[PDB]
Design a protein around this ligand. Structure first.
Ligand code: 3BV
Ligand code: MG
Lengths: 231, 195, 243, 250, 235, 240, 244, 212
């Protein structure tokens, strides 16, 4: 009310309203799902268009051969944060000849987002990110929120109606976690998960967006006729 | 670059400047004009390090032209010479100094008098009846000391100048491919085409 | 009025309302505690399990500074990380210049001054965390607790978060019942019990326990996490006490 | 972080007033009375030493300050503002004059430099004006003796005699009746003590009054001998005893 | 007042949303993409009859293979075009090749959110960027001050945008010839424009692989206007 | 440095500081530009509440940017000097690097760009000035007349006016100027310019300034008597 | 942050006026009147000191009239402290020009640069403008004798006779009445004083409440002299014109 | 290097050799020493290879930006001055370039500008640049007339490079010819000195110093 003019101001109950308003931009964004087994880690994302004449806004971004994310909210902020991740992964490779741990990737994003919430003039990031990756400790899935909070999970979803897919994955936990050495089945589980967030619209060939990374699989993205297999 | 001369007479200033541009064992050009018009009644000849000369001349030209437009008024030769001197005086203590020597010939319309200023690359200014830069002085000064009079006409000055060029063409080691001569007076600047 | 809209502005009372508002954010956060013992310190924290989908053991909240200091906090988790990052830089430069690892009281003031600095200007926000931290140095064991205002003191026991009052009460009993001192291995068990008792103030979601410790004899003066058999032994001790 | 106040905190109001300067002058009005009188052969500046507590040692707090050997200053208003102005004033006398010309600045020019500092606090970003008026007395070879008043705006005026602060309106009237152009220095000290008694309420003695003169050169206060041209400081601070001697024949 | 980079309670940046209102006040611009080329057309909208309309420059070349139309506060577009041209030429210097249309658009959109308390406010102009490259062929992009860009088969921006967009929804198909597209832009511009459409108050342009980006003459457009009127009367 | 964003969007999509700068232009004295077949004429109003003026030394309303281009304005006088200075410097800088004087379009584009920069730069307000820039490109005889405004937009005009009561004189020009046949001579062009100012001015004494620009750096300002003859001639034809 | 306390000194009103400039002019209208009159053989500068006290040192005082160089002087109206900042800048600017061109600075060039400084404070920087109006009186070999005025807006204009500060409306009407072009210095002296005498808010105009200065060619042959009048010289010139 | 370009009745001829050397090591015999800047502008290279190659392609990018901004092809004078002002900024740093900016525009006509790395900029009708410039001058000057035909002018340019290629140890490989007309530049082939020397010797009867 009187305490939402900028990010530097606390409310009387101890809330940061600008950070909460940035969180609201994620809820308006299109749904995206993330899940993983022990061998692989999968991202599924529902893309969104302006109208029938427009293209579908790309949700998934590669960060390295072994890491990438999906987005929900302000796309330009995702481009800034992804580009920062691309540099950090690249710094680790050039200087230490070392693939950047997915956990460190989260710690770095957390600290970058935080600085924007404690200084005058700046604003919080208005996007949420799901980061998947395979490193020296196996598969990983992370959830980033622009408050700074990063969380490691087996599965999750963010965006509009993300609660449906999040409930499904909470039921299916025991099943999909043991889908080892089988990419197509882990995707099928992720596609069925995102389907629990659909209303009036179904998954079409230029609507769906899948990305996978794992033991003997680099981070790759599937679109167009390559996802027709999963409808 | 090399030879630049100047003679102030009763009613005008006359500047002569060599035409040759040499680099290594080749005369690349034999028709080079080593001068810039700073204002309608002010002319500057220049000589020195390659590149620096034209870069400096044009930079001064731009500044004087800028002044003229701003004030709708022509600076006096004395005022222009002082500006040029200060620019060179700044330059000499820079990281890379301009290695350029200039002569400034002008006609002051308020005084109705011709004026000739000699300025070296250090920023050393002197007003003179006749002037030269480089090795040219070593021949011309003693010659002018003898033949120069303060009340000479423009025609007398050109003959005096022919005498200088002849002496240089006889005793100078290098072929400087003759000179371009220009006159500055009450009516402005004009070039003598047959010299 | 309007005295509470800007940081670093004094009210007619002589108070900085923005710092007091930051304390509210700390009170909203999960419970964390610190127990000073014979030859070291013990830290413990409550991790709320929001969902089945959270990977157990893999959302670590306690942080090490240098090789001999542990830090835990309640409130805005990112603000706590920023403070530790600064703590690590402060410790690094101290060791760079003076060779010896940073003493705990020296470290305590480095954080204290930094947090206090964020109450001096309206262009920055106060920290939304109370930090419990400490370790072992040349003079022995020290436990500290730092607050948004920059205020810190040494402690025998410390607690902050939603269940601070329950934990404080339980801590006061240990201090009274053990005047000669508490052992490191005892303090780990007690820490577990106090977190489980403090969980009564946050009992909708069940939780995950996380403990760490520095001890001159048990961990050789270095900060380590409590895992495996020693962790499960501490959990079982706590489970037996609630029933 | 960083000073985000890069804008003026003193601005013109619709009526044409500069609010902060007016309010600074209001602070000066609340301040304790101080005065200055100019004689033929000297200048006197005086003020009441308002003690904050009887446990406080008022000798450690100097309201009258030496700026140069021939220039002194006193004030009315906020003491802390005055103290830093004296520091800056002393330094500017060296940096912008003595280190260039090898001699001390004349009174008028030092005053001009102080005024500049006070004017900038009226226009620069993120600052308030100084809450003081100064009276500066001094001597220099080519101008002789002189007395100047400097206000929070940065304006300065020369005076034969004047007073500033609490009871300045009455004190100025008293000085108009007594001031002539034939006043000797001793006569001016006498009139200064008379004028100050009116505004002071409690104790009136050498311990509650602070008074300094700009008069003859003082070779005994120089600290060395050998150079004929160096004859000593014209600024002298009257002692507690020296004031009480003049209060008997009052 | 309030911060320039402030979020609304709904999760949108106030200044970005307000700049979008400025673009709705701008003159109409339409773009259509075909397999034979991409067509760009704009409403000039002279404020007075004494104003020489040919000096109104709302269609602009970025490179030989990339063109650009604008709508809104058109003065703001100058530095965007300046950046785009530099980006295109710089890439050619570093890689001895044409730059992808998508990569050009992304580079322009990176400027968009570089505002706050960098420039003092967002851009108040939207751009239609049309071009061709060897990889993705003929392309049309809509670049906003939010920092977002969508590819479009067809797109209208400005005051008559929502009406023109609904018309493009019906008329566009994947087999449209270049000539068919030219007429379609003229047809839809004539519908949404205030004053009567002619060669002086409207301007066409296209980009083809063979001939590159070309702004049409007033003589060439005038004939396409005459051809359009005749075809509508013929049934 | 002072950083404040002074020029910002409002809910309805307007930048009020830019729009309020246009109000300053509307307050300024009227200025008019008319281009003929072989010339451009710049007319300017001078308010007569100021007697005891010294017209020798008082800043003239029309300024030379180069020997071939001129700039008149409407709005804040002090603001116009800053734009004129920058334009004059760029004019000499162009001659220095391109070895050719500026075109009128280029000089306008530059001035308009400067104005635009001040509408989205922190710490600054927009220029409260609109300009009329007129001249002839090097080695060209086609007349050029351009207009700029605080927002930064610029455009070419057959004839245009700016300043106070400019909507009245624009109304006059819109019916009195034929695109198919512009003023064929210098006299015709000056007369149409003076006529248009006489719709708004008051007295044709020391209130009107006229400057004529012709090809190849031929610029001259008319004196009182020369202008007064146009005023005397127009009034006698009017009584009909 | 600090946005809360920003007055925004450099913005437009809805009417297209600069608030702070308008308010600075309102400030200046309460300052002591200063008059400049330009004759064919010189220039007069007359100014009224702000309500004087009898114990003010009059002879060693300077409030209104300042020397910029040997050929240019200024009369001030507004905040003295602000004026001195600008005067020292103008004094330096004159010396820079002399150093560069070996010629005394033309009056207008000095006036333009000082006015350009004032303009800057109204467009950028977020600071308050200078609350000062100047009357420039000077000579150069291009235009001869010249009078200018500048104000907080940074706008300057040339004059034959002009007043600034208090009661300019009444003062300008009186000057417009009795001024003519063939006027001499001694006549202009009399006009300047007579005008102040009628427009003053005081009871009677006396020597101690005035500052006076002429710029004549009344030296020996083709050179300009600046005379800043002493107290006794103002007393005499006041008797000589029969005001006291 | 040997590079030349001269002005004549029918436009501009530009001829260069194709040799690159590192000391006495012949590094390449197939180096392109003419840089095509646009259909109407050419740039010749002599001195440091990287310096010339890098900054002349950069010059092309600046010329492209001029015609995008100004909707008009850049003048030869303006193009040459961009390059000369650039190298002047690096004066003393050690750049080594002797270049010639050739082209035709409507306002200028056929124009040649000499630009070198110490900042010299000269307009002129004939220039030879490089280690073998004097050898090229000798043949070119002695046979040059303004009234030369296009056929004869092409041959003289070719024959001058051959003269230098023969005598100068640091010139050779092959001759690259260019003709610049009102319509633009035209490429007139690569001519290997291996075959060209003997062909010219036999047909012309020159080069009697050489064992036939
Ligand atoms: C005639 C043909 C000869 O003068 C021309 O002038 C040609 C101009 C054409 C090629 C554009 N000039 C040269 O061939 C030129 C002469 C030269 C050499 C060195 C400095 C300045 C001028 N040669 C080169 O530029 C060669 C060309 C390469 C070998 C194909 N390059 C070098 O000599 C390089 C880079 C020189 C250099 C310049 C500035 C800083 C560092 C290095 N040097 C080497 O490759 C080193 N060398 C290779 C052989 O192994 C030993 C190390
Ligand atoms: Mg050879």
């Amino acid at each position: 009310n009187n305490y939402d003019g900028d990010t530097v101001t606390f409310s009387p109950t101890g809330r940061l309203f600008q950070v909460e308003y940035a969180l609201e931009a994620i809820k308006q964004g299109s749904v995206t799902v993330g899940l993983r087994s022990n061998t692989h880690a999968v991202l599924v994302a529902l893309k969104r268009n302006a109208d029938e004449l427009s293209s579908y806004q790309k949700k998934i971004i590669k960060c390295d051969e072994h890491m990438g994310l999906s987005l929900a909210g302000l796309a330009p902020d995702a481009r800034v944060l992804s580009n920062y991740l691309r540099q950090q992964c690249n710094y680790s490779s050039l200087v230490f000849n070392r693939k950047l741990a997915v956990e460190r990737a989260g710690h770095l994003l957390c600290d970058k987002a935080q600085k924007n919430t404690q200084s005058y003039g700046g604003r919080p990031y208005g996007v949420g990110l799901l980061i998947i990756g395979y490193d020296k400790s196996g598969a990983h899935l992370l959830e980033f929120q622009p408050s700074g909070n990063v969380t490691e999970l087996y599965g999750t979803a963010i965006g509009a109606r993300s609660q449906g897919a999040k409930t499904y994955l909470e039921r299916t936990l025991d099943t999909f976690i043991k889908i080892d050495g089988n990419p197509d089945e882990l995707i099928k589980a992720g596609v069925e998960a995102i389907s629990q967030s659909l209303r009036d619209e179904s998954l079409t060939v230029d609507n769906l967006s899948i990305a996978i990374v794992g033991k003997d699989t680099p981070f790759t993205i599937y679109d167009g006729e390559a996802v027709a297999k999963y409808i | 670059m090399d030879i630049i001369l100047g003679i102030r007479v009763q009613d005008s200033v006359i500047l002569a400047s060599s035409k040759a541009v040499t680099r290594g064992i080749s005369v690349l050009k034999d028709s080079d004009d080593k001068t810039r018009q700073l204002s309608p009644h002010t002319l500057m000849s220049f000589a020195g390090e390659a590149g620096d000369t034209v870069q400096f001349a044009e930079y001064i030209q731009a500044n004087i032209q800028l002044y003229s437009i701003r004030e709708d008024y022509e600076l006096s030769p004395q005022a222009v010479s002082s500006f040029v001197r200060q620019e060179l005086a700044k330059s000499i203590r820079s990281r890379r100094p301009y290695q350029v020597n200039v002569l400034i010939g002008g006609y002051d319309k308020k005084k109705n008098k011709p004026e000739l200023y000699q300025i070296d690359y250090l920023g050393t200014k002197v007003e003179l009846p006749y002037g030269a830069h480089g090795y040219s002085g070593f021949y011309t000064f003693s010659l002018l000391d003898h033949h120069y009079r303060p009340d000479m006409t423009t025609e007398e000055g050109l003959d005096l100048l022919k005498l200088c060029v002849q002496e240089l063409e006889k005793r100078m080691p290098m072929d400087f491919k003759g000179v371009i001569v220009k006159i500055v007076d009450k009516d402005g600047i004009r070039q003598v085409d047959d010299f | 009025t309007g005295y509470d809209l800007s940081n670093s502005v004094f009210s007619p009372d002589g108070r900085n309302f923005q710092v007091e508002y930051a304390v509210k954010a700390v009170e909203n956060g999960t419970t964390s505690i610190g127990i000073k013992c014979n030859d070291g310190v013990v830290f413990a924290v409550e991790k709320l399990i929001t969902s089945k989908l959270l990977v157990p053991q893999k959302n670590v909240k306690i942080q090490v500074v240098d090789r001999h200091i542990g830090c835990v906090y309640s409130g805005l988790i990112p603000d706590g990380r920023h403070l530790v990052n600064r703590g690590r830089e402060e410790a690094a430069s101290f060791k760079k210049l003076y060779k010896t690892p940073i003493p705990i009281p020296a470290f305590a003031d480095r954080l204290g001054q930094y947090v206090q600095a964020h109450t001096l200007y309206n262009s920055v926000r106060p920290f939304g965390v109370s930090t419990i931290f400490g370790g072992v140095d040349k003079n022995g064991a020290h436990l500290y607790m730092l607050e948004p205002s920059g205020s810190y003191w040494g402690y025998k026991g410390a607690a902050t978060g939603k269940g601070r009052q329950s934990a404080k009460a339980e801590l006061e009993k240990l201090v009274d019942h053990h005047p000669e001192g508490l052992s490191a291995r005892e303090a780990v068990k007690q820490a577990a019990k106090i977190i489980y008792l403090a969980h009564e103030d946050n009992k909708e979601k069940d939780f995950e326990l996380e403990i760490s410790w520095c001890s001159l004899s048990e961990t050789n003066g270095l900060h380590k996490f409590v895992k495996g058999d020693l962790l499960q032994e501490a959990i079982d001790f706590a489970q037996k006490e609630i029933n | 972080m960083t000073d985000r106040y890069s804008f003026s905190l003193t601005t013109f109001s619709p009526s044409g007033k500069l609010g902060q300067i007016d309010y600074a002058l209001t602070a000066v009005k609340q301040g304790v009375t101080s005065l200055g009188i100019k004689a033929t052969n000297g200048v006197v500046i005086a003020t009441e030493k308002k003690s904050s507590s009887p446990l406080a040692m008022s000798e450690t707090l100097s309201k009258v300050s030496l700026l140069t050997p021939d220039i002194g200053a006193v004030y009315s208003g906020m003491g802390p503002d005055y103290r830093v102005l004296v520091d800056k004033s002393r330094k500017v006398a060296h940096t912008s004059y003595k280190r260039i010309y090898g001699e001390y600045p004349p009174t008028k020019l030092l005053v001009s430099e102080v005024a500049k500092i006070m004017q900038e606090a009226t226009q620069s970003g993120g600052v308030r004006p100084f809450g003081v008026s100064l009276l500066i007395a001094g001597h220099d070879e080519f101008n002789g003796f002189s007395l100047y008043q400097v206000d929070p705006s940065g304006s300065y005026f020369p005076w034969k005699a004047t007073a500033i602060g609490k009871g300045s309106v009455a004190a100025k009237t008293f000085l108009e009746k007594r001031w002539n152009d034939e006043l000797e220095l001793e006569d001016a000290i006498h009139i200064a003590l008379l004028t100050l008694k009116e505004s002071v309420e409690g104790e009136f003695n050498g311990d509650t009054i602070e008074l300094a003169i700009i008069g003859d050169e003082n070779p005994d206060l120089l600290g060395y001998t050998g150079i004929p041209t160096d004859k000593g400081p014209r600024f002298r601070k009257l002692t507690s005893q020296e004031i009480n001697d003049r209060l008997e024949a009052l | 007042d309030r911060g320039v980079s402030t979020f609304s309670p709904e999760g949108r940046l106030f200044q970005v949303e307000y700049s979008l209102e400025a673009i709705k006040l701008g003159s109409t611009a339409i773009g259509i993409a075909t397999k034979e080329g991409v067509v760009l057309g704009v409403e000039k909208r002279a404020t007075s009859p004494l104003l020489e309309s040919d000096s109104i420059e709302k269609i602009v070349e970025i490179d030989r293979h990339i063109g650009c139309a604008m709508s809104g506060l058109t003065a703001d577009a100058r530095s965007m075009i300046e950046h785009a041209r530099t980006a295109a030429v710089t890439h050619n210097l570093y890689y001895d090749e044409d730059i992808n249309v998508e990569s050009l658009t992304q580079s322009v959109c990176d400027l968009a959110l570089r505002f706050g308390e960098l420039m003092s406010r967002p851009f108040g102009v939207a751009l239609l960027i049309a071009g061709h490259d060897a990889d993705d062929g003929y392309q049309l992009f809509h670049a906003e001050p939010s920092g977002t860009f969508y590819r479009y088969n067809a797109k209208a921006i400005g005051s008559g945008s929502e009406g023109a967009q609904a018309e493009l929804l019906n008329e566009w198909h994947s087999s449209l010839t270049l000539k068919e597209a030219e007429l379609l832009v003229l047809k839809i511009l004539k519908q949404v424009m205030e004053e009567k459409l002619d060669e002086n108050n409207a301007q066409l342009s296209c980009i083809t692989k063979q001939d590159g980006f070309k702004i049409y003459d007033n003589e060439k457009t005038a004939e396409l206007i005459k051809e359009l009127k005749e075809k509508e009367a013929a049934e | 440095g002072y950083d404040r964003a002074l020029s910002i969007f409002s809910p309805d999509g307007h930048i009020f500081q830019v729009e309020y700068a246009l109000e300053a232009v509307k307050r300024g004295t009227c200025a008019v530009g008319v281009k003929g077949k072989n010339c451009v004429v710049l007319g300017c109003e001078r308010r007569s509440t100021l007697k005891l003026q010294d017209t020798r030394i008082t800043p003239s309303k029309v300024s030379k940017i180069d020997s071939h281009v001129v700039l008149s304005f409407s709005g804040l006088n002090a603001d116009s000097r800053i734009l004129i200075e920058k334009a004059r410097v760029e004019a000499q800088s162009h001659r220095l690097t391109l070895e050719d004087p500026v075109t009128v379009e280029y000089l306008t584009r530059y001035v308009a760009g400067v104005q635009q920069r001040y509408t989205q730069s922190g710490g600054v307000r927009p220029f409260g000035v609109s300009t009329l820039i007129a001249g002839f490109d090097p080695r060209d005889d086609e007349p050029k007349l351009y207009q700029t405004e605080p927002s930064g937009i610029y455009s070419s005009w057959s004839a245009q006016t700016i300043g106070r009561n400019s909507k009245t004189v624009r109304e006059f020009l819109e019916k009195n100027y034929d695109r198919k046949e512009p003023p064929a001579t210098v006299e015709e062009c000056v007369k149409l310019t003076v006529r248009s100012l006489l719709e708004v001015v008051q007295t044709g004494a020391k209130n009107i300034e006229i400057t004529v620009v012709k090809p190849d750096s031929d610029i001259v300002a008319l004196s009182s008597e020369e202008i007064n003859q146009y005023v005397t001639q127009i009034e006698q034809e009017k009584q009909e | 942050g600090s946005r809360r306390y920003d007055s925004r000194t450099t913005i437009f009103s809805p009417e297209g006026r600069l608030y702070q400039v308008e308010y600075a002019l309102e400030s200046i209208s309460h300052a002591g009147t200063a008059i400049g009159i330009m004759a064919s053989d010189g220039i007069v500068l007359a100014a009224e000191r702000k309500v004087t006290s009898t114990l003010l040192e009059q002879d060693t005082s300077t409030e209104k009239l300042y020397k910029l160089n040997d050929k240019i002087a200024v009369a001030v109206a507004g905040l003295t402290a602000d004026a001195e900042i600008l005067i020292n800048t103008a004094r330096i600017h004159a010396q820079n020009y002399l150093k560069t061109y070996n010629e005394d600075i033309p009056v207008e060039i000095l006036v333009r640069r000082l006015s350009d400084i004032k303009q800057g404070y109204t467009q950028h920087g977020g600071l308050r403008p200078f609350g000062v109006s100047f009357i420039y009186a000077g000579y150069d070999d291009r235009y001869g004798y010249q009078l200018y005025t500048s104000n907080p807006s940074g706008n300057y204009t040339g004059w034959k006779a002009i007043s600034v500060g208090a009661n300019t409306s009444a003062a300008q009407t009186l000057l417009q009445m009795d001024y003519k072009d063939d006027m001499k210095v001694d006549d202009a002296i009399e006009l300047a004083l007579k005008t102040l005498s009628k427009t003053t808010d005081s009871s009677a105009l006396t020597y101690d409440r005035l500052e006076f200065a002429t710029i004549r060619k009344g030296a020996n042959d083709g050179e300009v002299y600046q005379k800043i009048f002493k107290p006794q010289e103002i007393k005499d010139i006041l008797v000589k014109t029969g005001i006291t | 290097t040997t590079t030349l370009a001269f002005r004549f009745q029918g436009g501009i001829i530009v001829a260069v050799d194709s040799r690159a050397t590192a000391g006495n090591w012949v590094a390449s015999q197939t180096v392109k020493k003419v840089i095509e800047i646009n259909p109407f502008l050419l740039g010749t290279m002599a001195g440091g290879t990287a310096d010339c190659q890098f900054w002349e392609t950069w010059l092309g990018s600046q010329c492209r930006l001029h015609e995008l901004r100004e909707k008009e092809r850049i003048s030869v004078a303006a193009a040459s001055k961009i390059l000369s002002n650039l190298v002047y900024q690096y004066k003393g740093a050690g750049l080594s370039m002797g270049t010639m900016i050739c082209g035709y525009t409507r306002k200028e006509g056929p124009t040649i500008y000499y630009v070198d790395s110490d900042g010299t900029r000269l307009k002129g009708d004939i220039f030879c640049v490089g280690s073998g410039q004097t050898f090229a001058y000798g043949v070119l000057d002695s046979n040059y007339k303004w009234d030369l035909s296009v056929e004869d002018a092409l041959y003289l340019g070719k024959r001058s490079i051959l003269a230098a290629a023969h005598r100068d140890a640091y010139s050779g490989g092959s001759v690259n010819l260019y003709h610049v007309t009102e319509d633009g530049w035209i490429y007139h082939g690569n001519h290997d000195v291996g075959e060209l020397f003997w062909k010219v010797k036999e047909e012309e009867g020159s080069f009697n110093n050489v064992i036939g």
